[PDB]
């Protein structure tokens, strides 16, 4: 059993991208999908689609990179240079609207889970609500 | 403790021409002439590459040396500029320039700063009417800095104000050589002051 | 350590050991001599460093040091202690204040006169 499914998915992606995979698979759960729906919209990934493997529900996440660079090590830049888990079991984190952090002077995001649903640090700020600071991406 | 000692000796150790002497410093004999090297038995010997530190320690000594102010006061003013909104340098310099003794020198009632400082201490100066014998008095925008009435007949004040006829004054200031009055129009902008100092290094020295 | 562990035991604020039990850690402490023997420097050095055994008011009998070119301390000389070790004499952690009590101040001293307790020379 995974101790933290969300921290798992965030990683499957972190890992997949360093070897420049085409897409990685993560077991499926609504919450996980809601998160993807954001990476997707915020442009951190090409997108995700629901598949099945050996009968079990997964979430094919199609990753995104940059252009093949020039010089030694022509490996593309990362779209997702960073994707780190914050509120975790054993150490939950909750922020008030006036406390939602501003990721990378704005250039990045933060995904909270509010009672108004999963949202980015702007989306939530705008709706004027805070919640559990799920992760941080940039 | 306003120093009270050799002043052309400070221009020499400063490498830069400091006009903390007023007259004389404007005529071939400034001591800086025929001795652009620091005062001392080793003055002329070749200098060693000053340490990042020194470069700032000197730079501050220069600025402060100019307005002839104690480090005690100089610091407390800098710190005040640290709290105010705006480029600390622009506020620091503006604040140093608001000193009554300094303003007096500007309006030319005195050839130097130390002469001005005395003209302040001996009541020869007036702010908006009443006198003020505090060199540190801060002149805000809109004050009329004049010469003490019962003082306008002093030989030192005559030839000093006479030499101001025809001479232009800082843009932020206003002078009326007739009635011997003056006007602190506005806090000078960095631009307005052309000091031989990079305050940036100063903000850095007090940032240790 | 896990958060649970920290929550469980937390971190430990380690304390500071006073390297000068001049008790009450007071600025200075008064004492009377007992011995005025001389001592020999540590490894790298050699000389005849001057030391005094002071029986402090703080109920402490400790070794002080007598700084300066030369002194005048004897058996029952009351002196003032100030703390400050001597890196060449292990066990000598306190300095004795020249110019206080029976401790005369270094005569004919022009430089660091403030220390060594010596009045301004009346240069005519």
């Amino acid at each position: 059993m995974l101790t933290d499914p969300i921290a798992d998915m965030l990683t499957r992606i972190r890992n997949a991208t360093r070897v420049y995979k085409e897409s990685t698979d993560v077991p499926a759960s609504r919450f996980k999908e809601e998160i993807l729906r954001i990476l997707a919209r915020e442009g951190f990934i090409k997108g995700y689609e629901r598949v099945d493997v050996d009968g079990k529900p997964y979430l094919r996440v199609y990753l995104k990179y940059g252009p093949r660079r020039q010089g030694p090590d022509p490996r593309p830049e990362q779209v997702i240079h960073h994707i780190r888990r914050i509120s975790k079991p054993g150490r939950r984190v909750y922020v008030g609207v006036k406390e939602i952090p501003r990721v990378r002077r704005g250039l990045g995001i933060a995904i909270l889970s509010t009672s108004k649903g999963v949202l980015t640090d702007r989306e939530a700020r705008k709706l004027g609500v805070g919640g559990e600071l799920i992760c941080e991406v940039w | 403790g306003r120093y009270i000692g050799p002043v052309c000796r400070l221009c020499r150790r400063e490498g830069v021409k400091l006009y903390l002497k007023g007259e004389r410093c404007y005529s071939p004999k400034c001591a800086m002439e025929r001795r652009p090297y620091p005062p001392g038995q080793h003055g002329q010997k070749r200098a060693r590459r000053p340490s990042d530190y020194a470069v700032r320690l000197r730079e501050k000594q220069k600025l402060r040396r100019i307005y002839g102010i104690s480090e005690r006061q100089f610091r407390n003013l800098f710190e005040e500029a640290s709290k105010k909104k705006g480029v600390t340098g622009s506020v620091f310099l503006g604040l140093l320039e608001s000193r009554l003794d300094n303003v007096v020198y500007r309006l030319g009632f005195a050839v130097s700063r130390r002469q001005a400082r005395q003209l302040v201490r001996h009541g020869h100066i007036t702010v908006n009417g009443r006198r003020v014998d505090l060199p540190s008095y801060r002149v805000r925008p809109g004050d009329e800095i004049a010469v003490a009435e019962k003082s306008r007949n002093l030989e030192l004040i005559r030839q000093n104000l006479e030499a101001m006829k025809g001479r232009k004054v800082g843009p932020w200031l206003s002078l009326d050589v007739e009635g011997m009055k003056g006007k602190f129009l506005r806090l000078p902008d960095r631009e307005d002051l052309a000091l031989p100092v990079n305050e940036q290094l100063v903000i850095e020295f007090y940032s240790r | 350590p896990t958060i649970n562990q920290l929550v469980r035991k937390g971190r430990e604020k380690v304390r500071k050991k006073s390297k000068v039990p001049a008790l009450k850690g007071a600025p200075f402490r008064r004492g009377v001599c007992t011995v005025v023997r001389t001592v020999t420097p540590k490894k790298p050095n050699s000389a005849l460093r001057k030391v005094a055994k002071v029986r402090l008011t703080s109920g402490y009998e400790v070794t002080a040091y007598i700084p300066g070119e030369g002194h005048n301390l004897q058996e029952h000389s009351v002196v003032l202690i100030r703390g400050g070790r001597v890196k060449d004499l292990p066990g000598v952690r306190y300095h004795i204040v020249r110019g206080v009590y029976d401790a005369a101040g270094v005569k004919d001293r022009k430089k660091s006169r403030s220390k060594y307790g010596t009045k301004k020379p009346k240069e005519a």
Binding site: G90, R91, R92, V93 | - | I3, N4, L6, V7
Partner: protein, 104 residues
Amino acid sequence: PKKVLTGVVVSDKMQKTVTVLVERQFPHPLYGKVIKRSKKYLAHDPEEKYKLGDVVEIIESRPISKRKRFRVLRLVESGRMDLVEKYLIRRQNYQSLSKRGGKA
């Protein structure tokens, strides 16, 4: 407002008095983790109407004795000795850490 608390009846070995164990969750002041914590209040039961495993509300009352400054307000849900259980066992291993011979 007279404070109202909710806990489990861990004991009724008293005449008109029940021990109510109340729990409380909250973030750690420095470590953030949401920690648990509890305290037992001696509630007043004049008609000894409540028994072990009853979850009752407790209400801030005017003093009935030392230790007793609370009265049993009502019943929330009954019959859950599963809770009493824990409290009991937490006490179980207690008397097994000293000089008794290690016999527990």
